[PDB]
Structures are given as structure tokens and as C-alpha cells.
Amino acid sequence: KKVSYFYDEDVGNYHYGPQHPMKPHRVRMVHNLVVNYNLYEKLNVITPVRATRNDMTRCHTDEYIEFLWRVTPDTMEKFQPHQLKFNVGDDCPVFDGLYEFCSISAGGSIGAAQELNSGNAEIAINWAGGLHHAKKREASGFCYVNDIALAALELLKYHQRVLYIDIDVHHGDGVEEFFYTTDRVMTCSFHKFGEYFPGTGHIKDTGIGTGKNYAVNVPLRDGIDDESYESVFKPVISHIMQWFRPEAVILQCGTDSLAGDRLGCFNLSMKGHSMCVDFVKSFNLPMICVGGGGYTVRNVARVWTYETGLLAGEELDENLPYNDYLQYYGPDYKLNVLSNNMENHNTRQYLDSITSEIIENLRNLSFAP
Amino acid sequence: HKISVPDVLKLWLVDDWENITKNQQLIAIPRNPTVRAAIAAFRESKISHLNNEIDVDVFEQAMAGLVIYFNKCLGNMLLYRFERQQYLEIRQQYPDTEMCDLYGVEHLIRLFVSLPELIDRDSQSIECLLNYIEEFLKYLVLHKDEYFIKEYQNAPPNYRSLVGV
Amino acid sequence: FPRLPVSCLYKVSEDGLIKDFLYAIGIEAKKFNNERKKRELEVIPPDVKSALLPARTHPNLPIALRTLFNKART
Amino acid sequence: RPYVYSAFMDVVKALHNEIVDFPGFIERISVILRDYPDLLEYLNIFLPSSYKYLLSNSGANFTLQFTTPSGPVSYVATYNDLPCTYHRAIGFVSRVRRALLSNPEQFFKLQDSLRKFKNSECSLSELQTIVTSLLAEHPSLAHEFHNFLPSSIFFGSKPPLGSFPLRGIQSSQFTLSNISDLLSQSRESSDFFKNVKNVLTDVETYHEFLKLLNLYVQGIIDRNILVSRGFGFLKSNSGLWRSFLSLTSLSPEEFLSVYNSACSDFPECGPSYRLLPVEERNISCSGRDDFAWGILNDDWVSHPTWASEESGFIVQRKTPYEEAMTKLEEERYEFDRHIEATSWTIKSLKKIQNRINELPEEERETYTLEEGLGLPSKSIYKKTIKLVYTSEHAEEMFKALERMPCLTLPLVISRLEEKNEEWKSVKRSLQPGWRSIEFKNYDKSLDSQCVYFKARDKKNVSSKFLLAEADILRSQAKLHFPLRSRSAFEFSFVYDNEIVLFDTCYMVCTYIVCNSPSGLKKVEHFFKNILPLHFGLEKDKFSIFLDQVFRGPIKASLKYPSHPDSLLEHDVDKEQFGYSSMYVFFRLFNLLYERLYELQRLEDQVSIIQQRIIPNPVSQKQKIWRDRWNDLSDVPDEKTHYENTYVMILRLIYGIVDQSAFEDYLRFYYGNKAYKIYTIDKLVWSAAKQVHHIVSDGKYKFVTSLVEQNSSYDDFLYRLEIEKLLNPDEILFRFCWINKFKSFGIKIMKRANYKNYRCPFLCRNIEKERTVEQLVSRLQTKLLRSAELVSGLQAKLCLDSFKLLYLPRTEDSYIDASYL
Amino acid sequence: NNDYCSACHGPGNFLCCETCPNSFHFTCIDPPIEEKNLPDDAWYCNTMVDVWMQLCTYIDSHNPIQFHLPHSISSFFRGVGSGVMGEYIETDVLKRDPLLLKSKSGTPILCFRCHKSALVSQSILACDYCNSYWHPDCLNPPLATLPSNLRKWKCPNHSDHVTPRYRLPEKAKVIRVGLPRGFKNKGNIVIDFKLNFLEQIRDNVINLRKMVEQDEQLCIETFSKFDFYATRDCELPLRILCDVANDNLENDDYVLALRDLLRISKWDPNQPVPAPFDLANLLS
Ligand SMILES: [K+]
Ligand SMILES: [K+]
Ligand SMILES: [Zn+2]
Ligand SMILES: [Zn+2]
Ligand SMILES: [Zn+2]
Ligand SMILES: [Zn+2]
């Protein structure tokens, strides 16, 4: 009955590249607020046991987990053909101290799952790792090791059914591909389908094998506001809880679905993003809330902090205390994050049609022979 | 000069063309019947009409010359660019094997078809050559489960990036 | 000797097509109606496999279910 | 209004046919008759005793009553779903029996007391008082019982917290009656194929339906693909589709279940999954066991696409004021990352030193260490030393660190601290400039429209666009109702607020008085004479209070004007006809009216946009708190904020404020919510450029002079406009006015593009009527009460000699009732 | 040199040539090596079956090329052409603005499904194989974006979405099938004043009164049932709840929910089912 929090202080010091949009810095910023709000006396803070080389191969191939372990930026001509077979090198770059970062993230989320499995935590947080793009045989879109597909397998040891909700702006496609033929992990994802990054995530991609009708994709258009999102989000998740009837949830609370993001298209805000966490929290299931995207670090640092205090059952004031990055937080030094006035493209027609199609697919287990 | 092709073979050739140069699919190169079994299987079926001796000698000469020749064009001009990478790998997994022992008749009809062009440099021999070319074509199409594949293979994900994808 | 599976386009008449369609669909509808009627009278054994096979909309499921749930209950 | 009437009738129909329950009827009606509180108050007579609307403030807030609570109007178009309700009932009784397990008589009294209510022997307010008595200690249960009550049913498209759905939903395809056309349209052998050729009029849409039927015949598709691919062919004929559903013996409760699955696919994996080669499906992951190869997908890959933007994340362009907060953020990050890394390293090396110097003094002198000392994260330690220590000279400093870490340890700790202080010093001296750029770019980064709306709205206010929209609305209504469309009224505007209706005209002539020094003998003649002809104004208070403009009191005071009282007096009360140049004025005028009405309704939340910027005590450490009310010039001193925004628009018009100062004023007060006022100068320029056209141009001056002179006589107007044809080059519209509801209305009537017409008859001869729809009604009742009416006469056209050829023996004969 | 492979006309890492200046992908070259030749390359600068095998051995000295097809096999079917580097393209699918209001033939532009224009939902789509317009929000999969303006689009109302693939010999003709029933195929078929205006006005008036009487009689029968509509449709959830809480196995819609529960926990047919209340401890 105390939200178990996972933080390893060494994480903020890893650096992808010259102007890469990904800054691990932002998990440090969060903790600053979390530590000055007198929050970390209410949480149950735990340093993760780093993940070895033998854990990350429970879902990845040995010639890959054993390539990340040996590549360095200096000796990257002795691995020159290996950074095309494995996709490392230019967009998921080689940086000083890569394998230790992967160990940190993976060990944190595997430890969260282990914490839930024993009756010790009912919620467990890990903002360091929500890397949901990483493939079993290569790296994809700023991710190298798929930590969610390692916490799900460890969750699939005491729980019959497990649900993975994904509110990033991108399609979480590695976690879907890892579980595309099983009726024990249902992967639901609200993403921006179009000419957008992953390229995948059609509404017609809905399972195979024994796990047919067990993958849910909700393709939106750009500019979705905070009320359109709630209309399309609450009924889908209520229907999934009525039909699938999970036993533990993994929520990936990515924050490029927010307004003013250097990579996102949506138009959410801090409350428009927190209503999802608050709604999923209300069902009394063991949850694991992990990080994800988010490339405008002043907004990320404040939203994840609000939600950390939200899950913990505490009320945070709207004024940021004295912290070490206060001058990041703009004029007005408030906790909130506010929306653009950008135009929405999701008509009510679009949202009703796709919601009813999803419910059609979801009902098709007792409504079929 | 011009040879005639069964319209079934035109359909199959154009299907292979689209399947590899557009859909990024591959033929699983180690061929159960190879280019060497598929010439002996034609000789041992055509030898029943080898009555006159000069014709026997010309038939033997043609078959031997053409197998050793198909070995001299499988690296030059019987592959699309998307098929060069898969070449190297096999050339590195089977270092000193003859090519007309791994590739099959999918790659051999490409040589029959492309020979009013290569023949431009003419008393009798060209006609007797093209005759067996035509009879070989219609002898292959009759045996569509002896000399042809049942699927094109999906080019692996790592494979695409190495050629230009 | 095998030849092309599609060698040309064919012109058809609308009325022969329409009579063909009416015949085919009359046959199919006569089939489905007797299938419906025979399903209407099935038993669905009472204590048989839990998590039954039939579709939800089966006129005799809710007596199989009733008798096995009254079995298990006391 | 044909759409509103037809929508009411369809919702009543669907209640009768049982596509819609009482909740669905109530809520769809609430959405249809929202502007008509007279009709809702009338309907309240029929509704049952306990389920009535509760209108307030003339119909600005209504909430239907129920048996236990009242419930406010939301809309999503809910339907009914019984399995969901049974699942909620099962869960709730589960939890309730699990909470009361102690004494087995308070779940007994909840059992034998819902039974009585089921028969009849309790009531909502009688059962609820016992349910609220048993579930007294458990306040989370008694809060879930409130979802099984008559109030949670009505607007229930949103599930509560911790609860399965309440209703079901479906699409509606833009119908004012939120009813899906999968349930409306779908709830002989010569009767079917005769009609299909009438409906499917295009001859290559009919052929494409016969080919669907043919490839059904051949065996390529099954029954379901046929009945689901044919819906999109013949569904806008509720008899054709219902016929087809019986010609194939497919009942409508099954077509619903099979419709979605049977119109397309790359199925059973979807557009982006490929099966791996058999050789790859064996690459080995050494950590999995039995369980994880028999859960993880190994067969199917999907992989990162290109439809032009999908390999790598490379997102679109942003406003030039978000390229300046990204840059600021990057600079701050560079400094902070170097400082924090060097500090981590200092702390770690100090910890190593406080363990090497906690031993007896004889072993300290050579107590050795590995290459990365003991740190599990030696990457940080390596990079900081390579940076501080001149990388070309860092190598030895690694070496010396590992063999004598009792002489070198403090020597390098000191150097790291010195460099750190240098970095912090450089940092503290640039935070001023960071703050000063952040204070500029921040506000117009939550405001994207100050760049894009400037051209979107420029396409909005065109002539070609507004005319094209009138024409397409005419042709869209000429297809839903081929009979009740001659009462068209494409656009119906309601100008109820006169305090905004005075301000619109005020502004449009205040623009002209200053920007163009001509007219004003005709621009005031326009506003004094022509506008009350169309608009039903007092014309004497109006032209009194409208001279606060044409003669001055402005530019030194420039106040908000005084308003008349009752600017509006109290079938069509005034109809006029006019061509396109007047239609465009009536379009721009309503644009401006809607803008100022939005602006006037904004000012109620302006009190919570000003609480988002209340001071932060902790930032009163003398960092920025650069308050925003110091770059604002003199703010006006009127009563409420709408008048001040009005004075600021007048200043922008007069040239005493440029666009930047004006937009900054708007942003301070209304947030990013006032972005359609940003282009309110070119709007008023457009309206004032039209008003300057209804008065000159040598072609429209005559039309307006005629309209004015035959206004002293209704018959003269509509005869000279509609049956005598002075038309120059235009469309013809008829503008109405209904006083009781203050409604305006436009309607196309003709064109003016052939015509050497003189007249058939003598307009003196048919003189009766006042309006023109009354003229048409008189013709109709003269035809219905006729004493004889025969129309045998037919004819034919002569090709390339367009004369009529009346085929012989055919005659026509009418006789009126008074003749005999 | 030239910056395209001398075999396949492709971009990438080229092995260039010093003497005979050309470029090769080095695996599009002669026998592929792998890469890595830094010194000079000089890539190939230098009446019976006897002379024809001398042709065979003479083919060596001519700098490899890609394989394409002869002109007779690629130019044989309908809508098949090569690219620019000799790949297979479809020449029948080649050659956007969201808000269209009137076509250039001066007709309205209204959706085929709901009949409304490109003003209810911001955008409309035009078919290139028909004369029909659609809203992307009305297709059933709903298009989240719009296709490119260089490839043609096809509305839902064609049968090409169900006829599998056949390709036509590009010089075939249309055979007029005179056979008046039972013709087998697989989808390859082509198919073979009063001047009364007063009567029209009277027509319209009487039709309108017909419609008015129709709905006037509809509301008469509907509006008298409100009292039982309201009662049943609003006390439904409490009747469902009274049936579940009393465990009515005769409510044939209760046991169907119980079967959903047996179908969610994936019951094994070997164990006995639990009492209907004890299966409900799946829910909590
Ligand atoms: K799954
Ligand atoms: K997502
Ligand atoms: Zn993302
Ligand atoms: Zn090449
Ligand atoms: Zn539509
Ligand atoms: Zn079309």
C-alpha cells in the first residue's frame, strides 16, 4: 500500500548525441521536483538491480545483446558491418555508456514486475524506462532494449491475463510484435496513424493465431484535444475491462501526446493527459506505470511529477518549489502545462466509427462459435 | 532469329519479375532439382529418338556446351540487382561449387528466353540450337512440379538494407 | 498443353446474368432456411463441456446452461 | 427549415420502430429542438408526469427531470446494450455480497426488497431509502448503486470511474437525427431488378453491381460479402435494401454482425505483418525457457514504413517562436549536463578517497585500483576526465589514478572542482538573456494561429467562396427534399442581441469615416435608408444614435457609444430582392456579428485566465517575475471587457495601435482564445468595400436606387424584379425578416447570366397579393378548388430548330370555379 | 566518371574505375569480392557448336549488365512497364486538394453515402474510376489521411476489390458470349413535352398534404405510448438487478452472461462449474 518508486541516480548523466531529441536528463529533473515536494517520503524509493546479459536475451537475440555489450564509439570500425544488421549507428547512435543505460532501464522495470508479483506493491513506477520501439533483433526509434516485453513475461507468471495500454503519440510496435499471437497479453495503443513515424498500426492489425482480436489500435488524426481524447479513450478501456477482464496493467505514460512537443502532433494538456492515468487507476488492478517518449523536457518533467503525486494519493500545489532547474520552468513558474489553440482534425464521425468497430472486434469471443 | 515461348512461361516470367523487383521476395537458391539434374532429365527423355548418329553427337555437344555456358552467365547477366546480395552469401557458403549446381531452372529459362539477342555474331547450327531451346521450354512447362518452385521467399529484414533498401 | 487461365474479356447479357443470380440465390436461401429450422431443435447436452461451443444466439443454449448451473448450485 | 422538421419526424419514427428507447428520443430531441424553446415547452404537455424538460433563462439552460434526480443536457448518440448491464449487475452484487458477509440478513433484506419493487410494491424513492440504509458504512458501494437509477441512463456515453460501459454507440453520418443508417434503412423478381435500374442511374454504376452479383454466382464470394458490398450500392432507398435483405434471406439482426468484417481486406494479420523465412525463425535467444518460446511471436514481423515520413522521427515545421524556445532549452541543457556530470564524478572520487583513507597508514601508499576504479558506471568518470584533462593528456591520468590512488586522488579532485566553478560562473552570467528571450517567445508559442489564421481567414471572406457556398447549399437541399425545398432559406441568421447589432454597424461605418474620404453622403444614405428596409430597425433611434459617428463628439476620448433602447420592433414582415453584391455584404456583416458575439461571451472566464498567472512566492527570489502588465499601453476605462476590446479595435482602425500591440493586449486578457479578432481589420475592410459597391460602379447604383424608390407597392417590387427582368449580370436572392423571432433569411431564386424576354401577360391583370409566397399559395388554392382541369396536350421539339410541334388531337382545358 | 552503377543504374557506394571510367556497386560488379579495392581497378578494360561455344567463351570480356526481359515478354500483358533502373512498375495507376465544391463540368460535389458536401467534415475525395465523391469519414475503413495526387484512387463501389489478379495479353479482343445461361468465368466480363405545368403544381400540393397526414397519424399513435416507454426503458436496470441479486436462472439473458464468464476464465471441461454466485468471484 505504498507506491514503489524505482530510481538509479546515475541515469541522468547519459547523453545520446549533439542535438538528439532524447535527453535522459529529464528523469533527474522529475526527481528534483519529486524530492522537493516532500513526495519521496510518501513513496517507497528503490534502486534497481541492473539487468545482466542473460535477462535481456529472454526476448532479444544473442548476437545483438552481445553486440551492444562490446561496441564503443572509439572502436566502431571493428563493428562497421554490424551497425547495419542491427540498425545502430546513426539514429539510435553509439554513445559513451550505452549498455549501462540499457541495464538501468531493463532492471528497473523487471524489478517493478517482481515487486508486483509479491504482495508488496499494488502500484510500481519506473520513469527511466518505457522503451517500446525496440525489436527482438535490432534497435528502433531511440530504443535498444525492450524493457516492457521483459516485465510482461515476468508478470505472466502469477497473472492469467495482462493488459498493456500505450498513450504515446507513436505506435508502440515492438511490444505489439512481441505478443502478436497470444491471448494472454492484450496490447492496446492510441496513436497517430498517417505519415508518421512507425508507419504501422492500422486498425486492421488485430492479432493472429490464438491471439486474434487481442491487439487494439486506435488511429487518430493530428491536433486531438483533451475532450475528444477522453471520449475515444474511456469507452474503449471500459469495454476492454468488461470483455478481456485483465489481472494486471502496464500503462506506458509517454508525453509527446502533449501540446508543444518537438516531435508530437497531438494537443493534450496536463489534465487531458492525467485523466487517462486517473481512469485506469480506478479499477483496482496491480499497475505498473513506466515512462516513454517526451522531448520538450520542461513539460515532461512537470507532467510526470504531477502523475507521480497522483498515483501516490497526494495533492501537489500549483507552484513549483525551489529546485535546481527552476529557471527552465518559464515565466509564472507553475506546475500546469497548457494547450495550443491548434485546429483539431478528428470529427465526431471518425471517432464514433472507429470506436464502434473496435467494440465489434472486442465482443467477438462470446458472440462467435 | 526468334524463338517461341509458351504463354504460361511469359506469365510466369513476368510474375517473377514483379515478385523480386517490386515485392522484395527471393528464390530459395539451393534448388532440389538443379540446373544439372534438369538437363540429364531432358537428355534421358529425348534420347529415345536419337536414331541417326550425327544428331546424337550434335545433341551431346549442345547439352554439354550449354551447361558449362550457363555457368559463365549466372554472374554476369541472369540476375536483377536485388539478387546480387544473395549471390555473395552463397558464393561465401559454397566457395568452389559450380553455379549450375545450386541455381535452378527458374534461372535457366532466363537464358533460353534471352537468346535472339546474344546470337547476332549462320549456316545451320543456330537453327538446331533454337529447336532444342523450344523443345526444352515446352518440356519444362509440362513438368511444372519438377522444375519450378511453390513459393517465393520473403527477403529477410536485414537483407533489404544491404542491397539499397 | 496448358494455356493462359485468362486469355480475353467476355461480353455478357444482363438478363441471363440476372436469371443466373436469382437461381443461385434461391438455392442458397432454400438451404439456409432448413439449416435454421434444424438448429431450432437441438438439445445441447446438459452437463457437457463448460464454455460451450455454440454461438451466443442459439435457441437451446439457455436450457443447457440453466440445467448445469442448477446442477452445480447445491 | 426542412432538415429540422425531417429530423424530428425521423426520431419519432425510430422511437416507434424501437431503434431508440425513451432516453435516446429525449436526448436526440434535446439536440434537435435546442433553438426552439417554444417547441420544447409545447412538447412538455405530452411527456409523462415525471419526465419533463426544465428550461431556464428563455432556453439557455435546460435539464430533463427524472423520478429521483434532475439531469443536465450534455452529445455522442448512445444506444442500448443489455450484456453490459448484466455484467455491471453481476459485478455489483458480487461486491455487495462480499462486503456484507458478516451478518447474513442485510443482503437478505436487499434481496427481498428489490423483488417487491420489481412487482410493484415499492418505488424509486421508497426503495432508495432502504438501499441507502444498508449501504451506509460502505460509501463506495452506495455510489455504484447510483448507476442503476433512472438518472444515469439518460446522458451515458461516458462510463463512470471503475465501471463497465453504460450504453452502446454507433456512427451517424452527419444526420441531425443521430440515427445510424445501418438500422434505419434495414429494419418480387420483377420488383427488384426494375427498381435497381431506376436508383442506379449512372450506367457504369449499374454494371459494377451486376459484376458483384456475377462473381457471387461464379463462386468467388459468399453471401456475406455480397450483402455487405451491396449496401454501399443501394441503401438510400429504404425499400430496395429491405427487399434485397429478403431476396437473400438475410435478417437485419445478422447483417449488423457481419457488416464490418465483410468489406475488404488483407485479413488475418492486416496490412503490415510479414511471415519470417523458416531459416530465421530459429535465431537463438539463450535466456528463454519452455514458457517464453510458447508465448513470444517468432513467426510474424512488422517493419518501419515510408509513405514519405516514417524511417526515423522527422516531424513537420513549427512556428518561428517555437524554434526559439527549443534553442533556449538546448543551451541550458549543454551547460547543465556538463556541470552535473563533473559533480557526479567529484562525489564518487571523494567516496573512493574516504575509503582509501580509512585504513591503517601503512598500506595506503600502494593500495591499488582497477581501470574503472570500482564504479559500475565508469563511462561518466571516463568522459569527464577526458574533457577536463585535455584528452590528448588524459591517458596517463587514467594510469596514475589506478596505481597510486592516494597521491593523485586529491590532486585530481581539486582540479575537477576548479573547472566546475568556472563552468558555474559562466552559467550564472547568461541566465538574464535566457529569461529575456523566454519572456518574448513564450506567449506566442501556445498560440499557433497568429501565423496560419492570417491566410485561412483570407480565404474565408472571399466573394467567390461565399457565392460557391450558397450554390452548393442550394444543390444539396434540392436532393434531400425534392418537394419541401422550394421553401429553401439556405442561410437563416438570428440577430437577437441588439447591443452587438448596433456595434457591428457602428464599426463598419466608423471604418469608412476615417479610411476613405468620399461618400458619406451615400454611405450614410445607405445606413439610414437601405438597412432598415431589410433589417426591421426603428430607423429613428437608429439614425439618431448612428450620428455619434458621422459628425464626431474620438481620437482623444474615443469612447464606447451610448445605445438606443429597443432598437427592434415586435410570416415574412419584409422581403426584398437583391443580387450578389448585397448578398456578400449580408455575409460579411454576419461574420462580424458572430465575432463580436463570441468576444462578448468570452469575458465570463477572463477571471480564470488571470488566475493562471498569479505570482509565485518562490520566484520572488528576484528572478524574473517580469509582470506582463508593463508592456501594455493605456488600457481603457469602460465598464466590462467587451467595451475595452471594442475601444482597442477602434484604436487599431484609427492607426493609434499596430497589430503587435493589439494582439499582445488580446493575449493578456483572453489567453489564446481570442484568435479570430486578429484579422478583424481586413474583415471590416471587406465589409466597407462592399458598402462602397452598393452605392457606385455604374451598374449596381441603379439596382439600389430602384430598391429605394419603389419602397414607399410590394407588388411593384416583386413584379419589376421577378416578372419584368431588369437583370444586369448576377444571381437573384430574396432576403426576408421575421420580427417575432428577429430572424433573417436568404434564398436563391434565379440567375441572370438567352433572354430577350418582354412578357407574356399584363402585370396589372393579376393584382392581388402582398408577399410572393402568398401569391403562390393563392395559385395553389385556385387550382385545387377548380371547376375543371385537363392537360391532355403534349408536343415535341424539332431538332436543330427549337420549335414546338404539338401532336394533333391533344388538348388542354382549365375552367375556374366562378365561371359557372 | 558517372555517378550511377554501370549495370543497374543505382546510387550508393561505387567502386569506380581508373582507365575505363564506370561505376559498380562492387556486388553489381564482376564476381563480387566484398568491397575494398583502393589501388587501381581497371574493371575489364584490356560452323557447328564449336564457334558457338567460342561465342560462349567470348562473352567474358564485356563488363556485366543486369537482366531485364526481352521486349516481347515485358510488353505482353496489359498495364506493365519497366522503371528507369529496370524494375516492374504499373503504368495503369499513375496520375491533393481537400475542399472541392463544384466540378469543372459544373455539377454539385456531394458525398455518395450521406449526400452532403465538403463542409460537414472539412474534406471530400474524388474517384478516378467513377463519377462519385466520398468523405474519408464515411468509408468503412475510415481514411485517416488522403492518398497522393499521383496515384489514382478507387471508390468502394467497384468489383476490382474482389476479382483476384488476372492479366490480359494486351492484344486480346472482347469475345461476345452468345450462350444464354450457365457461362463459367472468374471475373473477366464486360457487359452488353406533355406540357403540363398546372398538373405538376396540383401534383405537388396533394403529395405534400399526403405527407403531412402521414406524420400526423404517426405522432398520434406514438405520443400515447410515452407513459409505458418511460416506465419500462427507465426501470430496466433495476429489474435486471433484481433478477441477478435473486439469482433467477430462468432469465435466459442472465445465464448468457454466466457463459461469457465461463468463456473468459477459459474453463476446462474437466472440473465442475461453480454455483452461479461463486463464478462471480471472477469479477472481484
Ligand atoms: K496479443
Ligand atoms: K501509442
Ligand atoms: Zn513516441
Ligand atoms: Zn549496381
Ligand atoms: Zn459521407
Ligand atoms: Zn468510384
Residue numbers in the entry:
A (entry chain B): 6 to 374
B (entry chain D): 170 to 290, 294 to 337
C (entry chain F): 331 to 404
D (entry chain A): 53 to 126, 131 to 243, 256 to 621, 708 to 724, 738 to 879, 886 to 926, 958 to 1024
E (entry chain G): 262 to 307, 333 to 381, 394 to 490, 515 to 606
Authors' own words:
The switch-independent 3 (SIN3)/histone deacetylase (HDAC) complexes are chromatin modifiers that catalyze local histone deacetylation and regulate global gene expression. The histone deacetylase Clr6 belongs to the zinc-dependent class I HDAC family, which serves as the catalytic subunits of multiple transcriptional regulatory complexes, such as SIN3, NuRD, CoREST, SMRT/NCoR and MiDAC. In each lobe, the Sin3 isoform (Pst1, Pst2, or Pst3) wraps up Clr6 through its HID and binds to the Prw1 through its HCR.
We sought to purify the endogenous SIN3/HDAC complexes from S. pombe by employing a C-terminal Flag-tag on the Sin3 homolog Pst1, Pst2, or Pst3. Cryo-EM analysis finally yielded a reconstruction of SIN3L at an average resolution of 3.2 Å from the Pst3-Flag yeast strain and a map of the SIN3S at 2.9 Å resolution from the Pst2-Flag yeast strain. In the structure of SIN3S, Pst2 organizes Clr6, Prw1, Cph1, Cph2, and two copies of Eaf3 (Eaf3 and Eaf3’), assembling into a delicate ‘Small’ scaffold. Unlike the SIN3L complex, the SIN3S complex reveals a compact organization with four modules: the Pst2 Lobe (Pst2_HID/HCR, Clr6, and Prw1), two histone binding modules (the HB1 module, consisting of Cph1_NTD and Eaf3, and the HB2 module, consisting of Cph2_NTD and Eaf3’), and a scaffold (Pst2_PAH1–3, Cph1_CTD, and Cph2_CTD). Similar to the Pst1 in the SIN3L, the HID of Pst2 binds to the Clr6 and the HCR interacts with Prw1, forming the Pst2 Lobe. The PAH1/2/3 of Pst2 respectively stabilizes Cph2_α4, Cph2_α5, or Cph1_α4 in the rear side of the deacetylase activity center, constructing the scaffold to bridge the Pst2 Lobe and the HB1/2 modules. In addition, the Cph1_β3 forms a β-sheet with the Cph2_β5–6, and the Cph1_α5 interacts with the Cph2_α6–7, forming two junctions to further stabilize the whole complex. The Cph1_NTD (consisting of PHD, SID, and BR) and the Cph2_NTD (consisting of PHD1, SID, and PHD2) respectively recruit the MRG domains of Eaf3 and Eaf3’ through their SIDs (α2–3), forming two separate modules. The highly conserved residues Asp118 of Cph1 and Asp264 of Cph2 may recognize and bind to the residue Lys4 of the H3 histone. The HB1 and HB2 of the SIN3S complex may offer two binding sites for the adjacent nucleosomes with H3K36me3 markers.
